[PDB]
């Protein structure tokens, strides 16, 4: 992230980056991350894996939105459902979305947010996904594969409908 438009680093230990005052991406957080998440005033923690975040969250007054998935199985239908739930969660306050390593599944949905919601073109979002410090491209084969060949116009159109 040297382009100021890319996600800014907050906590590289858990791969935590800021996309906006109301949206954060990261890897799997722990008990030590709770304090920081409350500074950022996170109200919703979206997870793309099965690990019950309520375990490390403790009695933190945040909503848990579990959306467990597999990057090699995601399609346009799942993406739209996630983007809608992310947007709705943003209206309630700042949101953290995460996975195991926060560069494949997270990198996929992050890039799609850039394209569908913020109106970035496909390659711009890709350049932030593969380069930006989230990981190396070997970790993102599934994510990279989907972003390419994804009908961005059909996604934006279907998004504008609902």
Author numbering: 34 to 195
What did the study's authors say about this model?
TpbA is a dual specific tyrosine phosphatase (DUSP) that has a conserved tyrosine phosphatase domain, and relevant phosphatase activities with p-nitrophenyl phosphate (pNPP) and phosphotyrosine peptides have been reported. TpbA (PA3885) from P. aeruginosa PA14 has been reported to be secreted to the periplasm and to link the extracellular quorum-sensing signals to EPS (extracellular polysaccharide) production and biofilm formation via negative regulation of c-di-GMP (3',5'-cyclic diguanylic acid), which regulates biological processes including motility and biofilm formation in bacteria. TpbA adopts a canonical eukaryotic-like DUSP fold with additional secondary structure elements that distinguish it from other DUSPs, including an N-terminal β-strand β0 that caps and extends the β-sheet, and a C-terminal helix α6 that packs on the outside of the protein. The active site architecture of the DUSP catalytic domain is defined by four loops: the protein tyrosine phosphatase (PTP) loop containing the conserved catalytic cysteine Cys132; the general acid loop containing a conserved aspartic acid that functions as a catalytic acid/base; a variable insert that varies among DUSPs and is predicted to involve in substrate recognition; and the α4-α5 loop that is equivalent to the Q-loop in protein tyrosine phosphatases (PTPs).
